[PDB]
């Protein structure tokens, strides 16, 4: 058969961009021709990422200056929440470019999420289309689904946003009392319409929803959402990049063969997350107080001058040599295969939570977002190949409590920690074992030409 | 069921209102409510047509006086071509009192023709909304579909008119030649935006299409039109009146009484059209021609002081009682019903059309516009339950061969004449079998509670 020519229109923040890129050279990888729309500086930005130049082309697309647009803003990285509708409705705009470059490109599928008019475009030019959503199954199926109802005049109440929809398949996967607001985003105001609205749409229009996930950690949730929407779920797996090769930094491969191995806890909390102050200091005294060695990279609080000014005073001289606190990028992937590293605390951000489930540290997690709290509850309650660290009222967790949750995965005497750590060996000899990945890209690419 | 609660916004002009008002009598006859939203003076003019007070209700809608209107102008029957797009910018500058309006009515669905923003409206409030036109489906299907590229900048080439676009399910349902310019609306300037951009946006907004029309006479066109835009087409059917159920005016009913059975051919040009001085002195003599008894209902041309006025010099000495040319509205359908009439010569406008596939006369057909010419295309052409007058240039046609179309189906010798009455008579009795129309009705409203 043919190959397919697949065009990708993702919504215009680098975290949409990026895994649409991976997914990309995934299919290039297997030689079908896929063409990227996204705006000017994105493209400068990730211009490197392109890893099959003759099989994957980018197309420019402009962003439109429309009323309350900041100059120069083309990605929502530029933009502040003041921002958000203008660059929704900027995005929205770009409607007639996009139905331009399709008309030359003559796709056979296109690759959507927020643009929820593609599918208008699929049947006035003539392509199938897949809504790719890179954000969690869970997240889609407790959201925005028929069986909830969402007021077009009102927003969601606490109590709404903590109620699951009929039929949603966990009652372990689920959002408490007080990370209800985590959940607020999916009724709120997206440019001309509200997102519940254009989510809606753009599942219902496509032919298709792809999903960045697996069967073994999703399938309930593809099932419910395949049964809601009356539409194929086609799971593309997690799409994970190659990590990065060459020799782990010397000076922190010195320092680690320094400790025992398995005896140092590792902490980092994404590339997008940066810490307030005081959420900062008690997170750097939660892990003194264990007394294990530690290794936290984390970006110093917003208009701190260095790590050391936000750090709480007399921090540095008590913990010597135990910790390092680092407030540059290091090389998590390296770090976490070191003999020396023994447990990962993650705020289970999509790329840390798989590298967590594929490494053989232990997993504690301090999620943040809606989605990092679902995926909390999947690894932590469901799955229970993980702890999760108890948090309070506007997400804010304790030294305590850190502590604690460190301890009961790191002692050799703690039941709990034996029990998550055989449940993480199961998993992860699952999921490393050969062809798994490659398996869902085949059937996804078999799927897409269905 | 609960009933349903529809509000109705058509396009400002007669033709457009009143067949909306047609609907809104047959739906709520079944106790669903109607709003319907109209400029006062279209309310003072079809105000009585009003059949069910408690369910169906008007509000009116200002029509905002915008550059170019001419005074007091609501209605395109109001204006000349001259301020056609100043009417669609005041159509279109209503907006904001209809979804002022809307947000009070809260209706369950809504139907739309022309107002292409109705859908924006929909997403933010949350209705459901039909597309509902008035026109035949093979207008639709032939002319502005996503297989037809128009250019937003050139026009649409005379070529380009006459070519069906790609996928048009009928070789005789199609233009000729000269007739190209008919179909030329299509590509017109219509206020802010062309007429193209206009019905595209509104075709593919719409949670369905609905047609007034029949799956037995334009089922492959309805079909089309679904393909095309992947949306369901729903089929009110026709939704004719019902008949003004009146004694006939004794002096026609005497005069009629003079001639023999099926022996009379009796003609109107609908409530519309004004013929020219030339074409209406041709359109008499060829009557004349014919020898045949006549019955010719026609406004007087435009600036003519009387009928007789406009005739050819010497017509009404020969004709004497043979042909009668009434300058006034008369009772077409109980004329139709009388036995003396058998043939009817029209303009195959859409209630002429139905009237006489009901009749038992014979169809003669001399089109004008471009539903016309199509539906004379279906009728004559493609199902041969008439016959067609063919015309020239300007769509002028000569009294040799309007004679020729008449004693073609009126001779009993004619070979033609029974071919086209067999015909007739085979649809008829399937367009009058009992239930017919309230199956279509029925269905329809079926439709709109999915
Ligand atoms: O100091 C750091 C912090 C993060 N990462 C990488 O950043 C990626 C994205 O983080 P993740 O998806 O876990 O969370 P997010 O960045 O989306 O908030 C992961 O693959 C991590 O390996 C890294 O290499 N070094
Ligand atoms: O002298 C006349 C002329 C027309 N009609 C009626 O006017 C209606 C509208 O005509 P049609 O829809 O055929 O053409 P249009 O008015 O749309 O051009 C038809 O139902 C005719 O029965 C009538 O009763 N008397």
């Given at each position: 058969k043919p190959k397919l020519h697949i065009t990708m229109f993702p919504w215009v923040a680098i975290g949409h961009i990026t895994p649409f890129i991976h997914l990309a050279n995934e299919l290039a990888k297997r030689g079908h021709s896929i063409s990227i729309l996204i705006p000017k500086k994105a493209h400068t930005q990730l211009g490197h990422n392109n890893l099959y130049p003759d099989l994957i082309k980018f197309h420019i697309v402009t962003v439109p200056h429309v009323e309350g647009l900041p100059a120069?803003?083309?990605?929502?990285?530029?933009?502040?929440?003041?921002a958000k509708n203008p660059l929704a409705i900027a995005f929205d705009a770009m409607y007639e470019q996009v139905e331009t470059l399709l008309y030359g490109l003559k796709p056979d599928i296109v690759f959507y999420d927020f643009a929820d008019w593609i599918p208008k475009l699929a049947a006035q030019i003539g392509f199938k289309t897949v809504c790719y959503n890179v954000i969690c199954a869970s997240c889609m199926a407790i959201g925005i689904v028929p069986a909830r109802h969402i007021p077009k005049d009102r927003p969601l109440t606490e109590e709404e946003l903590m109620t699951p929809p009929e039929?949603?398949?966990?009652?372990?996967?689920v959002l408490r009392g007080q990370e209800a607001r985590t959940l607020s985003f999916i009724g709120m105001d997206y440019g001309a319409t509200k997102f519940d609205v254009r989510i809606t749409a753009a599942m219902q229009g496509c032919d298709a929803i792809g999903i960045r996930t697996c069967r073994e950690l999703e399938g309930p949730m593809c099932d419910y959402l395949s049964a809601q929407y009356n539409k194929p779920v086609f799971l593309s797996g997690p799409?994970?990049?190659?990590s990065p090769k060459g020799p782990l930094e010397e000076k922190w491969e010195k320092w680690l063969n320094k400790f025992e191995p398995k005896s140092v806890v590792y902490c980092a909390f994404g590339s997008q997350m940066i810490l307030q102050k005081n959420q900062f200091q008690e997170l750097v005294l939660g892990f003194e107080m264990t007394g294990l060695p530690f290794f936290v990279a984390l970006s110093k609080p917003?208009?701190?001058?260095?790590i050391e000014e936000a750090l709480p005073e007399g921090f540095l001289e008590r913990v010597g040599d135990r910790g390092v606190v680092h407030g540059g990028w290091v090389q998590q992937t390296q770090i976490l295969n070191?003999?020396?590293?023994?447990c990962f605390v993650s705020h289970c951000g999509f790329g840390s939570m798989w590298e967590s489930l594929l490494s053989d540290s232990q997993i504690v997690l301090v999620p943040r977002l809606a989605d990092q709290i679902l995926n909390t509850r999947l690894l932590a309650?469901?799955?229970?190949?993980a702890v999760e660290v108890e948090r309070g009222d506007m997400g804010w967790f304790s030294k305590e409590d850190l502590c604690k949750a460190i301890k009961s995965v790191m002692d050799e005497e703690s039941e709990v920690g034996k029990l998550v750590k055989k449940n993480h060996a199961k998993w992860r000899e699952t999921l490393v074992s050969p062809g798994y990945m490659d398996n869902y890209l085949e059937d996804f690419i078999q799927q897409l030409y269905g």
């Open positions: 120069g803003a083309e990605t929502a990285s530029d933009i502040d929440i003041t039929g949603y398949p966990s009652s372990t996967v799409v994970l990049p190659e917003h208009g701190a001058d260095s070191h003999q020396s590293v023994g309650e469901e799955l229970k190949v």
